[PDB]
Structure formats: C-alpha cells, structure tokens
Design a protein around this nucleic acid. Structure first.
Lengths: 79, 197, 195, 78
RNA sequence: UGUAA
C-alpha cells in the first residue's frame, strides 16, 4: 500500500512520476506526497506513494528501479 | 524610471464603515474551502494592493490590522474570469472605499510581485518549485497610487496602520515572507516625498 | 505586463580571459578608498546586472565566485558624470566580454532595485534611512536580457555559477542580503522558457 | 574631544543637528556619528559629536534649550 | 504574522 520512492532529482515532477508508474501498469495510485525543503520549497528528492494493490507494490519495487528518471534510477522502499 | 508621488499620512482622512468578515473562521477551515474549490474552479487567484504613503521622507505601507499580531494588505480572491486589475478595484472599494456619493478612483498600474502556494499549506514563494506543475494559489501584488488627498472607510473590525519600511525589512516573524519582503521589491520606484499644506 | 525571454544554460558557452584584480586587496583597503574618494567625489555610484537563464523550467542567476564563500554580480563603479545604463554596458563587457572580436551588444532595460550604504561599513539597505541625507554608496540593479546564444569570457580569478532562485531565496548567509533578495524583485516578470 | 547627544528622533538628520550647533555659535565640529540598529538601519535616538573647550561647555549648556522636531536634546561627556 | 479578533 505505501512506498518510499527515492533518489529523485529536484526537478522530477508529479507528472513525471505518475507517467513512469502508469507505464509500468500500476493504475492504482492513491496519493503522491513530495517531501520538500520548507525554507525554499525545493524537493528533497523523495516522495511517499500510495498504491492499491500488492501486485502494484511488487511491480513498483521490481520494475521502477530499472528505468531511469531524468538520468537517475529511483530507489523504492516499503513502509 | 518610474516616478511615484508620496504624500504625508495626514493628507488622508480615515472614516469608518460596517464590519466585514472573512469567509473562513479558522486556519483549518481556510485550507478546507481551498481544497473544495480546487476541485471545482481549480487554482485560486488572489490580488492585493500596496498603498504607499510617507512620514518624515520615508515610505510607509498601509496595512489592515486584525488584533495585535495579524496584518494584511487590502485585497482578496478573484471571481472566475474576472480581470486582475478590475477585480482589485472592486475588492478595494469593498474594503477601503468611501461611503458617500463622490467617486474614489483607484490608480492601479504597477505589478510588484507574484507569489505561488505549492500545497494546501502556509508556505508561499516568489517562484514555482521545479517539481510543482499544479500550484494551489497564485497571488498578485499591484502598487496603488494615492492622489494628493483622499477619503477612506475602514470596517470597524479592522484598523489601519502605516508601517515604515525598516519595520518590515528582514522581519518575517513580524509580518510574514511577503509583506516583510516588500522593501526590496519597492526600491525600484523613485518616490517624491511631498510635504503638507 | 513584462515579457522576458529566457534560454537554456547550454545555449551559452563560457570561456576564459586574463585576470582582472579588484582595485583593493583587503576588506580594510576597500573601505579606506571609499572614505578617501567620498571627500573628493562624494557618493559612490555602483551599477550591477542580473543575467537570467533557465534550467529544468526554473530561472537561474549567473554569479561570479572569488573564494568558496564570496559571490557577486557583474558590475562595479561608475566614473563620475557617467550615465547609469551606459556605464553598466562598459563594466559588463569588461567582466564578461568576449575576446572573439564579434559584436556582443548588451540589452539593459529594467531597473529592479536600489541599495544605499549609510556608513563606511558593510550594511546596505533598500531604502535611505530617515536620519541619512548623504549616503556613501548607491547601488543600482538592472535586469539584462540575453540573446538566444552567447559566448562570454570569464577572468581566471573568477568562476561563473548559474544559481537557481531557491538556493538564493532566504539565503543571506550564503549570498549576502542583495543577491539573496533577488527572487522577490524578479517575480514581477513573465518569463518565457524557450526550449 | 567627545560629547554624547541623546533624546533625538529617528528622523533627526545629520543636517538637522549640524545647523542646531551652528545656531549656538560653534563652528568647530569634527565628526557626527549616529548610533544605529544594524538589522534595519534605524537611528536608535542618540549620536556622538567630535568638538575646542569653549565650544564644548557652550553646547552642554545651551543645546538642550533648543528643541528639534518637538523634542529637547540631552547632552553628556564621553 | 493567525482568531487571544
């Protein structure tokens, strides 16, 4: 259900992430909350992502670190 | 080079009118209505006016006080479709417009800033962070040129104060990031400090 | 109301040229020259230019570095009697001008701020304090519109950084109060991000 | 020779003070240094003036009896 | 700057 997607560049958008998830087959996206530097609004390079399936969780943990986002492979973690 | 005439605070008479209350009663309800309206009309569009006077040859910004610690510029949220300048003039009259039959025209010409709110949260910035594609609020600031003499009507709940620039400068804990960053933005203008009589 | 065209950082080539050392070596040496010049010529008039590019759909501000700690904008002192805008183009070409021979015309158009210095000390403010009638230095900031492509030449004692606005915003300990306060002033422009 | 002048308003300028002394009959002022807030640049309300001994006793005697911006100055030795 | 309004 809940996953940390990390190793993101600070210019990786919510569109960028949504487009990469959907390309993996996971449609069950429930929420995307970016963790950001409060003082200046910059992204800290990781987000919390809610999915609806254990199949979606599995695909995201296996196939997402494989592809590249703006020159950087993400690191997926449980929670 | 933009040349603005400033006049002393006493050139302006401050009357009173019936109280005006905010659509929101708490901070939590304020973000609640924002969430609801974002799914209806999308991003909120806000405008505010910077009325400038002077005392002792130093620029003063007119703020509306609510209590002891909360200050704001006169303005508010625009109705969908409404032009930014016309909407401000409307919003101005509602807050500070004189009550009698003589017209008070607003000279609103110069834009001094843009502020974006990336989430249904307090933080605002003079830019959109590179990871944000759908801001939740877009604020806009205009300099309002006051004429030599003018009459205003302040709602009973509010109070009107002339804040000197040095009071605002580097004082975010006092006035917030926007209001406290006004002196820097306002420095491009060439002010003439006109005297009384 | 104001349209400014920004282009990718990669549209610009940065080269090198021979060092251009500051007129004074120390902090004490620069405040003495200010004291000496003030008695003869009066208030110092400084103009500086803000060159804006973009990367990752965010405006970046080109700054020059001397240490690992000190950053500044391209600019400097006006010669007495010299026009503000005319003098900035002189200083701009002095600092970032190409050695190519090819014409590089600077487009300076919009004033973005004014900074005054009451005493012969570091503190600068964006207004003249009520009790001051003759400030010691008046620094004027202008926005400089760049061509789609350009070649600059950086003196070797300098290095050129493209600092994004968030690294600047609210960061006076990192950039000083003038450079750190640029985002706010800059926000009134409608920036086009040409790809 | 040094003299502290207080009870000044934050909009009392160097000019305003210079004339006030030149009205008392003291044309030998050295330098005026205002005490100011570092954060915003605002005058704290007092300054230090460099001065002759005749010009010093005069100013400590005669200055507080001439108001500036609706306020009487306060004088003190260094 | 947030209901102490």
């Amino acid at each position: 259900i809940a996953l940390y997607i990390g190793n993101l560049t600070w210019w990786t958008t919510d569109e960028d992430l949504t487009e990469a998830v959907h390309s993996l087959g996971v449609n069950d996206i429930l929420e995307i909350k970016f963790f950001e530097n409060r003082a200046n609004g910059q992204s800290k390079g990781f987000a919390l992502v809610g999915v609806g399936s254990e199949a979606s969780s599995k695909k995201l943990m296996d196939l997402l670190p494989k592809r590249e986002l703006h020159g950087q492979n993400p690191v997926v973690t449980p929670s | 080079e933009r040349t603005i005439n400033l006049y002393p605070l006493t050139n302006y008479t401050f009357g009173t009118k019936e109280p005006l209350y905010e659509k929101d009663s708490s901070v939590a309800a304020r973000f609640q209505r924002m969430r609801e309206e974002f799914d209806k009309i999308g991003m909120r569009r806000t405008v505010e006016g910077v009325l400038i006077v002077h005392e002792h040859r130093l620029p003063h910004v007119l703020l509306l006080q609510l209590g002891t610690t909360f200050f704001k510029l006169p303005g508010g949220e625009l109705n969908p479709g409404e032009d930014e300048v016309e909407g401000l003039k409307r919003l101005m009259t509602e807050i500070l417009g004189r009550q009698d039959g003589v017209l008070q025209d607003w000279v609103i010409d110069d834009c001094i800033g843009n502020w974006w709110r990336p989430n249904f949260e307090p933080p605002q910035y003079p830019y959109i962070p590179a990871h944000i594609t759908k801001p939740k609020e877009h604020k806009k600031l205009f300099l309002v040129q006051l004429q030599e003499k003018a009459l205003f009507a302040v709602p009973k709940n509010y109070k009107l104060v002339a804040a000197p620039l040095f009071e605002l400068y580097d004082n975010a804990p006092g006035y917030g990031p926007i209001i406290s960053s006004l002196p820097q933005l306002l420095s491009r203008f060439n002010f003439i400090y006109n005297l009384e009589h």
